[model samples]
Target: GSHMSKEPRDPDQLYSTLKSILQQVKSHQSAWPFMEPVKRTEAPGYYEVIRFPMDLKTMSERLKNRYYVSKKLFMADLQRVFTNCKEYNPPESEYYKCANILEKFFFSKIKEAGLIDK
Candidate 1:
């Protein structure tokens, strides 16, 4: 079962939860790359916990909520989400390419705002 906690209380728990989500998503065959076009969607309830295309404002709010717990851990989770999304979509799919591009932009904004170390 997927962890439905709104926010992980600790760095380790956060890491574990994010990893589990990634593993679960990866477990779905539809998420994997294929020659044919597959309209892959995120696992149900996944977004109820963590939403993607994380913008600077959202990230800032999250950091503030937890007193900015471990930027490294937070960034890792974001990166993991990006990786999962990239892997989830087929290479030929526009979503796959567009999502990664957006993900990169989000990271760049975070860095520019000094939210995370360069």
Candidate 2:
């Protein structure tokens, strides 16, 4: 009979890993603005400009829902979050600055965790 050993091949393993990383990203200081959906009233034309609005809240929900097929997909969503911020806000804007710092922090965090080797 074939035998199996402990491996990172289970769906639950991937999901839990993503969940852990998601929480870490959400708990960051610079993550305040990205924790919720961007309101149209608060950010005029934001919805119109960002077709795929990404935030930590949605990412958390998606993680629970198993929307990501792999760690790379989860990374892509968070990357899009920063991309959307830069696309919508001026380069000199505070939101843009926050996104930059948070994005850098996220990559370093992921590196430390050995996640998303992509």
The estimated TM-scores of all candidates read 0.41, 0.81
Write down the TM-score for model 1: 0.41
The lDDT values for all models are 0.42, 0.70
Task: Give stretches of model 2 more than 4 Å off.
Answer: 1-10
Regions of candidate 1 where Cα sits further than 4 Å from its true position: 1-68, 116-118
lDDT of 1 by residue, 1-118 (tens): 9664355446545344433433333332332321112232344343443344332223333443553455455565445445544655455665455446545554454454333453
Error of 2 at 12 (Å): 2.5
How many clashing pairs per prediction, in order? 0, 0
Candidate 2's displacement at residue 53, Å, is 0.8
Worst lDDT 10-window in candidate 2: 2-11
